[PDB]
Structure 1
Amino acid sequence: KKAGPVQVLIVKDDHSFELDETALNRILLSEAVRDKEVVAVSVAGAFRKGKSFLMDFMLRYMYNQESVDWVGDYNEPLTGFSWRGGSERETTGIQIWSEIFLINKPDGKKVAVLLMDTQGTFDSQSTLRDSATVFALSTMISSIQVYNLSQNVQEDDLQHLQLFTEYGRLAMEETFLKPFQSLIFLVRDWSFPYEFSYGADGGAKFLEKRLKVSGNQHEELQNVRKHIHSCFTNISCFLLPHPGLKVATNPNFDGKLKEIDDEFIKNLKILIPWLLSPESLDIKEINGNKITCRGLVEYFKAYIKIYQGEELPHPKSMLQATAEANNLAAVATAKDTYNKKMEEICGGDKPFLAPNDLQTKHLQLKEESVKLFRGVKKMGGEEFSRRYLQQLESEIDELYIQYIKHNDSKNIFHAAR
């Protein structure tokens, strides 16, 4: 009866994902909201950075919109989505709030507002596929994604965003429009207001310089930025002050405003409506169509269904992915070398060779391809490269069988006359 967080996407110990359809259906398919267009707000990013903490202040705003003091009473504990200190991850999978909010757009549109809290990336229990799936899904479902970052916007942040969004793209319909809508770079604990002011305007100037594409820029840097711009219709940045050392280090801290830095609260009171004001709420769109709560449930099911199978390629650790590419490239190089040299010997316009001599040449050329494959430095491991070396040897054996038949025909076809 009382409102609370609802586990909607479950991530199990075996790294499998399961959707709680009953709960999702309960919330988004009720008669009161099912036919309404939907605004979905999500927060995502690294674990332990205050994502759920933030969402709970968004809840205070949603519940007390017409009040000037929505931020709460100063002795009131912060509740909603579960948050706490400690070095271990808290939120898992994807949670939504059980109460859908009905908000009047300035035109008169009665839209429904969904709030989505997510499992943090880069925890020690999770595989990269786990983190990417949760990040992609929230981005594919939300119309406003708050990318929660610590201290700065680093190049590895941009490359992770790129990886995660591209993974989302893969499971989506082909489209001629931008795949996603609003992205907010929220920088927590910004330490340089004297370089860029706290808030949206300092954020805007900061992010502008961060994502700017220039002709002098190395292609690797250009491309990640181009990808990001291509993915989102609106991109903004908000620079938030540190909430104070007590918020971060006191195990008894409760979310009470009286224990939070004043300049934080001041910028917080600007941040939330800036994200969530009736003016700012963009209705979810997928490939050119405004999605209702009913439609969102459908896409949520279809998307997770794709991530549950093996139709998509999955993201892998940095060393593992480079390693595969290293080996796949080496296998192709070694095989093409063997092949080119065999054609010089038993191509169609070359004379028939005695079988034993063909075999002797094959064995020499094969061994040279094996040596070539082995001499290329690859990440990561001669033991990672075993499966690929073995594939190379067997694929070359298969090619040689074709070459025997080709060689034999030069003798056979002539005998038949």
Structure 2
Amino acid sequence: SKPGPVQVVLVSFELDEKALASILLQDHIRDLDVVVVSVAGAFRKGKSFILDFMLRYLYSQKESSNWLGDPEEPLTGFSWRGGSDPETTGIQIWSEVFTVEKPGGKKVAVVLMDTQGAFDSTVKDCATIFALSTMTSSVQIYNLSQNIQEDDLQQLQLFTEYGRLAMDEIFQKPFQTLMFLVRDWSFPYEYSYGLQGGMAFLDKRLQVKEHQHEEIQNVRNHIHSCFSDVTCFLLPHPGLQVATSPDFDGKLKDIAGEFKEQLQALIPYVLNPSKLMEKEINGSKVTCRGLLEYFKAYIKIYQGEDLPHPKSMLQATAEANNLAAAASAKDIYYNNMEEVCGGEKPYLSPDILEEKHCEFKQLALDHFKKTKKMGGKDFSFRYQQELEEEIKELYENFCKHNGSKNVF
């Protein structure tokens, strides 16, 4: 009953769909728009240290004020690396999804994602892990040591023709925020720690120059077709005790002061309620229920020998987008009907049951049609017709359950 990391993508690659569904289709979050914060990068680069502070912020927020902690008390990690073979490639998420009220009262679900791979441009693939993580997250925090290297940028080539395809055919950038998190920044006299120094440094690194390799200048020329926002944050060194310790357990006061300072800017910048950014695809928000569909559609196309064609990535996106609309409509029909004739609630005469059915079927189909969907009308119809068959089967079970409560 204790929260912990859940392996959702593992070694080709497999989606553990049951484990992911058990988190995302919980009753209290499945209908909420979901915020998906991913930290991605090479093994042993401090990703889980940052994930731990994000959890401290989220748990402090859940139960309140000094999120950083008590300076006298030792730190304890949250066990993102507790399993066998911690250097393994894959994607984990935290088992506790948080519910946060944004200003004005809208409640959203907040998922934390741990994306680990070799991250080195050669022989094998973890590009699959970076792609799946990027396409499903709303903030991809790309965790790098000391600088943004040309190798680092070359790994974004995965998305370049995808971004160019989507702009050309759907008139929209496919992804939201990419943030370069530069660890152990050592030149504050050139670019100061934090966000303003980071954006000046990123601007310089993103400039195309004739000596760079062709593929890297490509990435520079099209990264802004992929992400609606590209940002960078320079974080200081945490101090030698953190750097040289396996499983750091020293007191908060033993962490370097400038690191703590910049942590208090970085973590709220990502997780403060006014900053939470719901996942969006095709310009419409994704719920925990819908997010499951994107994982299921994306795992399929990354099964092959080679990386998928961009047309197949757009195709999988369109299919999952319509399935997400259908699933949301199906839940509306089911929840309303179960409220009215489910359980041991009293028998309803066929006239009353039919009327309720007609009311909630129309509600459900209207919701599907009103929802913004990719593919055009003929593409979306096949999903609508599928939804109508599901509703018909649901209605039959509701009718047979209702009839079992009849007297004689």
TM-score normalised by structure 2 residue count = 0.68
Cα RMSD of the aligned pairs, angstroms, is 2.9
Find out whether 1:95 has 2:66 as its counterpart.
no
SS state of the match for residue 308, structure 1? coil
Contact 2:194 2:234 in 1 (8 A): yes
Find out whether 1:249 has 2:244 as its counterpart.
yes
Aligned residue for 1:76?
74
Aligned residue for 2:298?
303
Given residue 102 of structure 2, which amino acid in structure 1 is its aligned partner?
Answer: K
Aligned residue for 1:266?
261
Residues 139-158 of structure 1: matches in 2 within 5 Å? 139-158=134-153
State the Cα distance separating 1:93 from its structure 2 match. 1.0
Find out whether 1:197 has 2:192 as its counterpart.
yes
Identical counterparts, % of pairs: 66
State the Cα distance separating 1:251 from its structure 2 match. 3.8
Aligned residue for 2:57?
61
SS state of the match for residue 65, structure 1? helix
Find out whether 1:18 has 2:9 as its counterpart.
no
Taking the aligned partners of 2:250 and 2:142, their CA distance within structure 1 comes to 21
Identify if the C-alpha distance between structure 1 residues 120 and 73 changes in structure 2 by more than 3 Å, giving closer, same or farther.
Answer: farther
State the Cα distance separating 1:206 from its structure 2 match. 1.1
Taking the aligned partners of 1:279 and 1:311, their CA distance within structure 2 comes to 41
Taking the aligned partners of 1:172 and 1:81, their CA distance within structure 2 comes to 38
SS state of the match for residue 250, structure 1? coil
Find out whether 1:33 has 2:29 as its counterpart.
yes
Identify if the C-alpha distance between structure 1 residues 252 and 141 changes in structure 2 by more than 3 Å, giving closer, same or farther.
Answer: closer
Structure 2 residues not aligned, in runs of 5+: 310-408
Given residue 233 of structure 1, which amino acid in structure 2 is its aligned partner?
Answer: S
Given residue 8 of structure 1, which amino acid in structure 2 is its aligned partner?
Answer: V
Taking the aligned partners of 1:58 and 1:48, their CA distance within structure 2 comes to 18
Residues 113-152 of structure 1: matches in 2 within 5 Å? 113-122=110-119, 128-129=124-125, 131-152=126-147
Identify if the C-alpha distance between structure 1 residues 311 and 247 changes in structure 2 by more than 3 Å, giving closer, same or farther.
Answer: closer
Taking the aligned partners of 1:218 and 1:90, their CA distance within structure 2 comes to 30
State the Cα distance separating 1:234 from its structure 2 match. 0.9
Find out whether 1:236 has 2:231 as its counterpart.
yes
Taking the aligned partners of 2:45 and 2:136, their CA distance within structure 1 comes to 22
State the Cα distance separating 1:52 from its structure 2 match. 1.4
TM-score normalised by structure 1 residue count = 0.67
State the Cα distance separating 1:252 from its structure 2 match. 6.2
State the Cα distance separating 1:296 from its structure 2 match. 0.3
Taking the aligned partners of 2:35 and 2:150, their CA distance within structure 1 comes to 30
Taking the aligned partners of 2:18 and 2:215, their CA distance within structure 1 comes to 45
Find out whether 1:289 has 2:287 as its counterpart.
no
Taking the aligned partners of 1:228 and 1:3, their CA distance within structure 2 comes to 36
Identify if the C-alpha distance between structure 1 residues 143 and 247 changes in structure 2 by more than 3 Å, giving closer, same or farther.
Answer: same
The C-alpha deviation readout for 1:46-70, integer Å capped at 9, x for no partner, is: 2210111111110000111276410
Given residue 112 of structure 1, which amino acid in structure 2 is its aligned partner?
Answer: A
Moved more, 102-111 or 140-149: 102-111
SS state of the match for residue 176, structure 2? strand
Contact 1:55 1:81 in 2 (8 A): no
Given residue 93 of structure 2, which amino acid in structure 1 is its aligned partner?
Answer: I
Taking the aligned partners of 1:244 and 1:76, their CA distance within structure 2 comes to 15
Aligned residue for 1:376?
none
State the Cα distance separating 1:222 from its structure 2 match. 4.1
SS state of the match for residue 249, structure 2? coil
Structure 1 residues not aligned, in runs of 5+: 315-417
Given residue 156 of structure 1, which amino acid in structure 2 is its aligned partner?
Answer: D
Identify if the C-alpha distance between structure 1 residues 263 and 95 changes in structure 2 by more than 3 Å, giving closer, same or farther.
Answer: same
Identify if the C-alpha distance between structure 1 residues 211 and 81 changes in structure 2 by more than 3 Å, giving closer, same or farther.
Answer: farther
Contact 2:4 2:94 in 1 (8 A): yes
Given residue 76 of structure 2, which amino acid in structure 1 is its aligned partner?
Answer: L
Identify if the C-alpha distance between structure 1 residues 264 and 166 changes in structure 2 by more than 3 Å, giving closer, same or farther.
Answer: same
Given residue 222 of structure 2, which amino acid in structure 1 is its aligned partner?
Answer: H
Given residue 99 of structure 1, which amino acid in structure 2 is its aligned partner?
Answer: E
Taking the aligned partners of 2:306 and 2:127, their CA distance within structure 1 comes to 16
State the Cα distance separating 1:221 from its structure 2 match. 5.2
Identify if the C-alpha distance between structure 1 residues 90 and 310 changes in structure 2 by more than 3 Å, giving closer, same or farther.
Answer: closer
Aligned residue for 1:106?
103
Taking the aligned partners of 1:267 and 1:95, their CA distance within structure 2 comes to 26
The C-alpha deviation readout for 1:92-129, integer Å capped at 9, x for no partner, is: 411110111101111321111110001232489x9532
Contact 1:171 1:303 in 2 (8 A): no
Contact 1:162 1:227 in 2 (8 A): no
State the Cα distance separating 1:312 from its structure 2 match. 4.2
Taking the aligned partners of 1:127 and 1:167, their CA distance within structure 2 comes to 22
SS state of the match for residue 61, structure 2? coil
Moved more, 40-49 or 89-98: 89-98
SS state of the match for residue 185, structure 2? coil
Identify if the C-alpha distance between structure 1 residues 53 and 168 changes in structure 2 by more than 3 Å, giving closer, same or farther.
Answer: farther
Find out whether 1:48 has 2:44 as its counterpart.
yes
